């Protein structure tokens, strides 16, 4: 309940100007440091054919979902690979919620 599907358009602007330095989803761009983020949702975690995971994400065999994403922002570390992310929380929690909905669009 902490996360509510707001508007993907609003988050798209936020993602477009604050998330292309890595995932670069661009609907079809190079994985770069982070995964395209266009297939994290689907079967278990870690399903990028090109980008590779530390394998830790695969061992957990967890499916990434909007609920799981809430735990990732609120608590992330031992649960998933020691992967380090340049993002360290967002001052605007409302804007962060919009980003979550936008990622769902990346999967489909
Ligand atoms: C490059 C330094 C990164 C930037 C900046 C962003 N992310 Fe990232 N992200 C990065 C890596 C190294 C990984 C892979 C870790 C793994 O094993 O999957 C990720 C992963 C995510 C995930 C899943 C959480 C996880 O499994 O660790 C999400 C949903 C995610 N990243 C979201 C996200 C958003 C909101 C960012 C821009 C707004 C963003 N990432 C930037 C590396 C980097």
Curated annotation (Swiss-Prot):
GO annotation (BP), single: mitochondrial electron transport, cytochrome c to oxygen
Principal place of residence: mitochondrion
Alphabetically ordered keywords of this record: Electron transport, Heme, Iron, Metal-binding, Methylation, Mitochondrion, Respiratory chain, Transport
Residues with N6,N6,N6-trimethyllysine modification: 77-78
Protein's cellular compartments: Mitochondrion intermembrane space
Database matches in Pfam families: Cytochrom_C
Function: Electron carrier protein. The oxidized form of the cytochrome c heme group can accept an electron from the heme group of the cytochrome c1 subunit of ubiquinol-cytochrome c oxidoreductase. Cytochrome c then transfers this electron to the dinuclear copper A center (CU(A)) of the COX2 subunit of cytochrome oxidase, the final protein carrier in the mitochondrial electron-transport chain. Isoform 1 (CYC1) is the predominant cytochrome c during aerobic/normoxic growth.
Protein name (record): Cytochrome c isoform 1
Gene source species: Saccharomyces cerevisiae (strain ATCC 204508 / S288c) (Baker's yeast)
């Amino acid at each position: 309940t902490e996360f509510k599907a707001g508007s993907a358009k609003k988050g798209a602007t936020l993602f477009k100007t604050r998330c292309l330095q890595c995932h670069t989803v661009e609907k079809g761009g190079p994985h770069k440091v982070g995964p395209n983020l266009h297939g994290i949702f689907g079967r278990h975690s870690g399903q990028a054919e090109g980008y590779s995971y530390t394998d830790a994400n695969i061992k957990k065999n967890v499916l990434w979902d909007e609920n799981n994403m809430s735990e990732y922002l609120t608590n992330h570390a031992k649960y998933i690979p020691g992967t380090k992310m340049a993002f360290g929380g967002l001052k605007k929690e409302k804007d962060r919620n919009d980003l979550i909905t936008y990622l769902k669009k990346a999967t489909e």
